[PDB]
Design a protein around this ligand. Sequence first.
Ligand SMILES: [Ca+2]
Length: 214
Amino acid sequence: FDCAEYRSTNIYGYGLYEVSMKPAKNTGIVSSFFTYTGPAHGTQWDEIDIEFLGKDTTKVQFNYYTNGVGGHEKVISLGFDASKGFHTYAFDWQPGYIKWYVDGVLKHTATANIPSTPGKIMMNLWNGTGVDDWLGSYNGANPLYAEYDWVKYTSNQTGGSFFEPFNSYNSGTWEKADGYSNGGVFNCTWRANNVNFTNDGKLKLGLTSSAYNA
Ligand SMILES: [Ca+2]
């Protein structure tokens, strides 16, 4: 299977992160929005997530890692099927807390071990393996798509905030991952061809089958 990941070329720190998106629905996959940095960037592993388990798009899972330590999962019931339309998700990441919101309403707050290292803004869609209890077993359904209408970041004591509407590939600010696979539980290869932009200005990530899957 071929999957998709769009990520920022620069790094960002404390500030408010907002994304308007519509994840994909299907057992075995994840659609997400998150910050990430790690060792392959000579840092501790720090990440804040917003993930939709395709197995149940009426819920959202929040998590974060500080120095490679995770285990802060929090699943919340949205009260709607995220896969049916665009909603705004966000997290405000400050030195002493992380607050997550859904359509402007505070849904969860974390204060233990909040991360500090700026990371890149990443969005991806993939099928997993080896973690059937968490994601459900992937049944090869394809093609599947996750859509993003816009990303906005408001820096604290940082430099530049930005607004990205996804009208087209802005390669000066983002990159499409290509030709490698994260390995581990990610059971697909990232492909730049699977990162596309629709006509009405949405980022569209696709999950498709490869020759050996048919
Ligand atoms: Ca847009």
